Short mmCIF file of C-alpha atoms in Angstrom, two decimals:
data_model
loop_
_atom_site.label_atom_id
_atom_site.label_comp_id
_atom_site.label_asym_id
_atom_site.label_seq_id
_atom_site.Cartn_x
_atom_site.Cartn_y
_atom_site.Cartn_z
CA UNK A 3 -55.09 -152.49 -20.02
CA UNK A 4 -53.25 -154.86 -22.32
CA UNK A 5 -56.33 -154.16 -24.54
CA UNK A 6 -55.10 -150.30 -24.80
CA UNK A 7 -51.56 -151.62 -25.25
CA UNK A 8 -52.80 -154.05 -28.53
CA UNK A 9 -54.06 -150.63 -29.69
CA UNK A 10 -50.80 -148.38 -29.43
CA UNK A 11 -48.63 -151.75 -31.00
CA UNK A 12 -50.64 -150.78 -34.15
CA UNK A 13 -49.87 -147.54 -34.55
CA UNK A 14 -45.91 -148.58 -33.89
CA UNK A 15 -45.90 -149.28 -37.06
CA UNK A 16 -47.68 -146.18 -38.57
CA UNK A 17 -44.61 -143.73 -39.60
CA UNK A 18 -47.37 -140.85 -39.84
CA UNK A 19 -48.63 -139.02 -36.87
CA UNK A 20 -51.85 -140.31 -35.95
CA UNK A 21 -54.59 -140.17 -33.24
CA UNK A 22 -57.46 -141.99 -32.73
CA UNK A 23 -60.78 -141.02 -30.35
CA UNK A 24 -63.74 -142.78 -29.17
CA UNK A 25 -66.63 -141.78 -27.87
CA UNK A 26 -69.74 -144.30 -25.96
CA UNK A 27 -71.15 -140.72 -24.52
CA UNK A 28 -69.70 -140.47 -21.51
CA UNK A 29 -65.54 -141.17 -21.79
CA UNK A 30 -63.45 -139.38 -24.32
CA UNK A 31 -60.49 -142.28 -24.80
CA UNK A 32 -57.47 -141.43 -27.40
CA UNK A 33 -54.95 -144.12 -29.08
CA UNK A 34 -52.06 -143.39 -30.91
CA UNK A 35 -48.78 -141.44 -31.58
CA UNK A 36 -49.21 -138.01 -30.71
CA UNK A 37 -52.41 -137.59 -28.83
CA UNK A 38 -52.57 -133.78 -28.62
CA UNK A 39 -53.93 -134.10 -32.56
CA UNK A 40 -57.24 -134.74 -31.01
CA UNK A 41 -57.38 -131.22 -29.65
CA UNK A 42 -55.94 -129.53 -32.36
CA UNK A 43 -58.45 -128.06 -35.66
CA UNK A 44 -58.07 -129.03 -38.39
CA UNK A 45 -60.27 -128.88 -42.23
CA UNK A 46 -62.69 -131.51 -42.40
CA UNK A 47 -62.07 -132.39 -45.61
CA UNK A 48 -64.96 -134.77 -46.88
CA UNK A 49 -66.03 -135.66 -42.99
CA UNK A 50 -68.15 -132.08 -44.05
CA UNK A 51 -70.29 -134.00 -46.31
CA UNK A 52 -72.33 -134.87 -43.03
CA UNK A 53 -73.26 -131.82 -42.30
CA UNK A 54 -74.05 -130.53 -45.77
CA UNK A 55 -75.92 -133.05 -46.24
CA UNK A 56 -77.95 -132.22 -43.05
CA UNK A 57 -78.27 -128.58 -43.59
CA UNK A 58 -79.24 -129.46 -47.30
CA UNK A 59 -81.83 -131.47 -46.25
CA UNK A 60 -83.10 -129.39 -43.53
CA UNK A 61 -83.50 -126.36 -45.16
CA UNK A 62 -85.32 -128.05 -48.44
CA UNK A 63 -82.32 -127.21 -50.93
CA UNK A 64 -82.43 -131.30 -51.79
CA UNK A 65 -84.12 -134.48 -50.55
CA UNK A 66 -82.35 -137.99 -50.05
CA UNK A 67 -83.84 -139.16 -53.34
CA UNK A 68 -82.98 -136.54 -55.66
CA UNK A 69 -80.70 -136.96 -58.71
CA UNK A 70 -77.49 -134.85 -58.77
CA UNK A 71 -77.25 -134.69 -62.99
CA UNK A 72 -73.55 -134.94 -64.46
CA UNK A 73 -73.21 -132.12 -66.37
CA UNK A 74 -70.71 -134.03 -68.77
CA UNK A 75 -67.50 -132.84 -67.70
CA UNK A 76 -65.18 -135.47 -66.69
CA UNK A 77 -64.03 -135.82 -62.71
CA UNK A 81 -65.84 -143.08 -61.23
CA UNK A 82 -67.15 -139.38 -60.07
CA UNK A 83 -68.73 -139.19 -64.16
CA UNK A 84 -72.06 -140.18 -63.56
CA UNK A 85 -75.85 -139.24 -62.13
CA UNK A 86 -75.68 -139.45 -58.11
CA UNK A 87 -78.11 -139.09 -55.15
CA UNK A 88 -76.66 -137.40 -52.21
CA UNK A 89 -76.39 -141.12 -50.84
CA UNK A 90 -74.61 -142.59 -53.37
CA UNK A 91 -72.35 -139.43 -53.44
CA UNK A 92 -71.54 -139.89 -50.17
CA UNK A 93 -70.32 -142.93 -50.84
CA UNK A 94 -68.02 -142.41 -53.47
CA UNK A 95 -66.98 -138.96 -51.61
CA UNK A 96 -67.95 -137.05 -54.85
CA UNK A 97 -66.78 -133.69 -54.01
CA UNK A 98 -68.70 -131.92 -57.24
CA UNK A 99 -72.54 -133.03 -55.76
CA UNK A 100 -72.11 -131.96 -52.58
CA UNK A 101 -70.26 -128.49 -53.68
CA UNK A 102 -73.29 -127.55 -55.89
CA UNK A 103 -75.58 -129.06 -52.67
CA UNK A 104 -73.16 -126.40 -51.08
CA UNK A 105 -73.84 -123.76 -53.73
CA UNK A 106 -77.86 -124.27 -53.03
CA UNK A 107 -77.29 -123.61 -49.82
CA UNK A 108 -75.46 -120.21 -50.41
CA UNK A 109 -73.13 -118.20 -47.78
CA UNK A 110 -75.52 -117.37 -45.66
CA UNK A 111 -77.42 -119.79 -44.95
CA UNK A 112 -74.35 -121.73 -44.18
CA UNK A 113 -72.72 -119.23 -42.14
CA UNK A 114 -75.84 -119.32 -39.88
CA UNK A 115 -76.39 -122.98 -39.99
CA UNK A 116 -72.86 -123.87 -38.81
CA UNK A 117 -73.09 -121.08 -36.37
CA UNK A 118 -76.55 -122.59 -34.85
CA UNK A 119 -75.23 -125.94 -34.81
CA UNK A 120 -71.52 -124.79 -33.62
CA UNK A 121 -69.77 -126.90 -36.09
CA UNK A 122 -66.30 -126.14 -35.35
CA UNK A 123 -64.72 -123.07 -35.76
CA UNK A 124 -67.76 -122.22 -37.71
CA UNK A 125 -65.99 -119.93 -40.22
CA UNK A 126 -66.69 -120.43 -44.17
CA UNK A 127 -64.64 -117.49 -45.72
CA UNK A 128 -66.00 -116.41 -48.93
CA UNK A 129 -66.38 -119.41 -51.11
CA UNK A 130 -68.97 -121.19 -50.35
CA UNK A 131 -68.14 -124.05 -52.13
CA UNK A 132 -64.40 -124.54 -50.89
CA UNK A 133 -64.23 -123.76 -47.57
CA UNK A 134 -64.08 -127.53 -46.15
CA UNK A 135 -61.32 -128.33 -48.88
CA UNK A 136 -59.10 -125.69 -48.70
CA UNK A 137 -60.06 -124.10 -45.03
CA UNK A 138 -61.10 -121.27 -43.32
CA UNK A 139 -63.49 -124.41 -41.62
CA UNK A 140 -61.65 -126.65 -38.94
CA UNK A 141 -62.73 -129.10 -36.43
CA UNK A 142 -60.80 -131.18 -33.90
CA UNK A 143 -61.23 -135.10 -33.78
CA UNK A 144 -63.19 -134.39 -30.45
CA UNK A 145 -65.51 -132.22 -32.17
CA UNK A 146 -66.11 -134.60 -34.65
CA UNK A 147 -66.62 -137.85 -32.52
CA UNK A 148 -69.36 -135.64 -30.20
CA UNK A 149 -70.98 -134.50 -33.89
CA UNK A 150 -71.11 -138.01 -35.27
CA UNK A 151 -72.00 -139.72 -31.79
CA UNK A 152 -75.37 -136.83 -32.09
CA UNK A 153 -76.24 -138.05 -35.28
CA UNK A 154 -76.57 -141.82 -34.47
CA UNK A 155 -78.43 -140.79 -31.31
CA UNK A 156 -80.88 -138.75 -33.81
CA UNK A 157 -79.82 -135.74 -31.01
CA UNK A 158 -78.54 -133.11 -33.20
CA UNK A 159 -80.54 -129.81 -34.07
CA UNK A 160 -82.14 -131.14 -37.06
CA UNK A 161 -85.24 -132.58 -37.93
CA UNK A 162 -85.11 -136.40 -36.81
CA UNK A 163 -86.37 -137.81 -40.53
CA UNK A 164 -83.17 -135.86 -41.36
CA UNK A 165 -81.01 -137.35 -39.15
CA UNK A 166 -82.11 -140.75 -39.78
CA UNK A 167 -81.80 -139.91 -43.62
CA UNK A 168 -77.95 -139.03 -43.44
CA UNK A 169 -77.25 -141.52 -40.86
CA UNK A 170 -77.88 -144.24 -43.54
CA UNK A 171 -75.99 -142.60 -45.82
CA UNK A 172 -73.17 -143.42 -43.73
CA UNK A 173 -73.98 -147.50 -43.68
CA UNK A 174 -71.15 -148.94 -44.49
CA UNK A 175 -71.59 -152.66 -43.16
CA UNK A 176 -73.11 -154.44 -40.33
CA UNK A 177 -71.54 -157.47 -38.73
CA UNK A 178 -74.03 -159.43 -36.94
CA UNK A 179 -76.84 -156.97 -35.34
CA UNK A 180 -73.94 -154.86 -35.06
CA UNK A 181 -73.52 -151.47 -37.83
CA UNK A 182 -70.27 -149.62 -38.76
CA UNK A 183 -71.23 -145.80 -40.18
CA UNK A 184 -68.19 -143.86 -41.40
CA UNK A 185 -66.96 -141.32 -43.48
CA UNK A 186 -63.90 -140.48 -44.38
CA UNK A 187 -61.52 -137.31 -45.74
CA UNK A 188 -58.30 -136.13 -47.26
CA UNK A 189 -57.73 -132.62 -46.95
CA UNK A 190 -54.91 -132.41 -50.17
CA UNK A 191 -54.94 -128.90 -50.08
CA UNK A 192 -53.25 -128.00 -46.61
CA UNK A 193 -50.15 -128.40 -45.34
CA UNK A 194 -49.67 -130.59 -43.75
CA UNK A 195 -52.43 -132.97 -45.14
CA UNK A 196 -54.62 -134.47 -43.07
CA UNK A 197 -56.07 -138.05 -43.29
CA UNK A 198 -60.22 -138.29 -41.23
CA UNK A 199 -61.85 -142.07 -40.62
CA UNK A 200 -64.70 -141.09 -38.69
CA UNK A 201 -68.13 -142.45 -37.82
CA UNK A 202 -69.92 -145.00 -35.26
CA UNK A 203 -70.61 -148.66 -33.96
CA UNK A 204 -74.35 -149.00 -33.03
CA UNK A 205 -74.60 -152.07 -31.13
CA UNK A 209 -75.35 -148.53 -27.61
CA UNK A 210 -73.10 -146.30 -29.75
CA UNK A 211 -69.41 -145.71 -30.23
CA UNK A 212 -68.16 -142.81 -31.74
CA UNK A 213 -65.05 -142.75 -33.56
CA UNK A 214 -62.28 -140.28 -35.42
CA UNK A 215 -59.43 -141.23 -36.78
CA UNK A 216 -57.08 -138.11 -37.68
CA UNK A 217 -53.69 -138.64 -38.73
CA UNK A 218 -51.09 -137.01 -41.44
CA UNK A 219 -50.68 -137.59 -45.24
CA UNK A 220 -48.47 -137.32 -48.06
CA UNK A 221 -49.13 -137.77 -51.52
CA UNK A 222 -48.46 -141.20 -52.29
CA UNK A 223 -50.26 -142.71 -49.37
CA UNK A 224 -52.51 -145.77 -49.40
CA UNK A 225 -55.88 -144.38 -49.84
CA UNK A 226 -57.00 -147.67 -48.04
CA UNK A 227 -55.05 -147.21 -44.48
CA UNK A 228 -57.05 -145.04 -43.13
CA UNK A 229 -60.29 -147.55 -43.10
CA UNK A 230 -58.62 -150.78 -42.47
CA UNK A 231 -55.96 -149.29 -40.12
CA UNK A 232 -59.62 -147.77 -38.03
CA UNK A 233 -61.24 -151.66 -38.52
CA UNK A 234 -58.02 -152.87 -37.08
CA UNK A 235 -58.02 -150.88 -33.76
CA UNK A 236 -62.05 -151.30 -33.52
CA UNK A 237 -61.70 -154.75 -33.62
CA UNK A 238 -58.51 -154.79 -30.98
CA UNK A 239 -61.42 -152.48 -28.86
CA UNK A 240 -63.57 -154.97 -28.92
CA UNK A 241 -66.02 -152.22 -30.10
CA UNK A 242 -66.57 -154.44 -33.32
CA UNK A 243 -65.23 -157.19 -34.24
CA UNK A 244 -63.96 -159.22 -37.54
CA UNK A 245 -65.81 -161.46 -38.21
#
């Protein structure tokens, strides 16, 4: 238990509300300073770019090899970009014309098939995970992501498999870290997403926690890192 009490002594520190969930597929565990976060919606933010990218995919509107063109007005963002590298760099414009492919309706029914969160997309198509009606709680997202590395959500598997190394961020002996993360700006609050999996078996992960304009855009990975590693779930090297 003094492993669990390593992980709380982090977030002592953290001034910002903050939770943090796991997920190995059976147990549901949460860390930090106000726990009822992880069962309370909120946007996605660019944690969506998983399942655009999947629905994209699925229903032919792109492939994992395409070229996203820059159409020369300025945005690091001001350049040519598959939907990989795009996810990467979080470029919001690739996967907001991926989303404009797709059109309303297709993503209305898509998101209602798969029952990604509250399932609701207003009437911009292209907005929706930025700005809301679309929310999700940390426990939706850690079952979603934990899916995806098991190749177990309603999508054809090459699909899976495609989008799941999209998320690659770095491996650490035979072990892999996938993640993704978000900043919804546009809501108030703001919220702050590090989510994603270990595949050693598979550990699911969200980080959800509040921001302010002004905040480190790096705390949200390295402050995740830090409480994997005091898991044991994956270590630093």
């Amino acid at each position: 238990s003094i492993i669990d009490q390593n992980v709380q002594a982090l977030f002592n520190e953290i001034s910002a509300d903050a939770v943090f969930v796991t997920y190995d597929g059976q147990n549901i565990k949460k860390y930090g300073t106000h726990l009822d976060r992880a069962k309370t919606a909120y946007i996605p933010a660019s944690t969506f770019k998983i399942a655009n990218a999947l629905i994209g995919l699925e229903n032919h509107k792109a492939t994992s090899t395409e070229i996203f063109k820059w159409d020369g007005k300025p945005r690091a963002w001001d350049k040519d970009f598959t939907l990989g590298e795009a996810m990467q760099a979080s470029t919001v414009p690739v996967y907001q014309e991926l989303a404009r492919r797709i059109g309303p309706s297709l993503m209305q029914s898509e998101l209602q098939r798969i029952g990604y969160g509250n399932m609701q997309i207003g009437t911009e198509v292209d907005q929706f995970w930025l700005k809301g009606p679309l929310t999700i709680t940390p426990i939706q997202e850690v079952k979603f992501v934990y899916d995806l590395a098991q190749g177990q959500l309603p999508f054809k598997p090459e699909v899976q498999q495609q989008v799941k190394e999209m998320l690659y961020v770095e491996r650490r002996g035979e072990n892999r870290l996938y993640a993704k993360s978000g900043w919804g700006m546009a809501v108030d609050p703001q919220v702050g997403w590090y989510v994603g999996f270990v595949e050693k078996q598979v550990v699911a992960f969200a980080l959800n926690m509040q921001m302010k304009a002004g905040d480190d855009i790096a705390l949200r990975k390295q402050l995740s890192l830090d409480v994997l590693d005091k898991l044991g779930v994956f270590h630093y090297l």
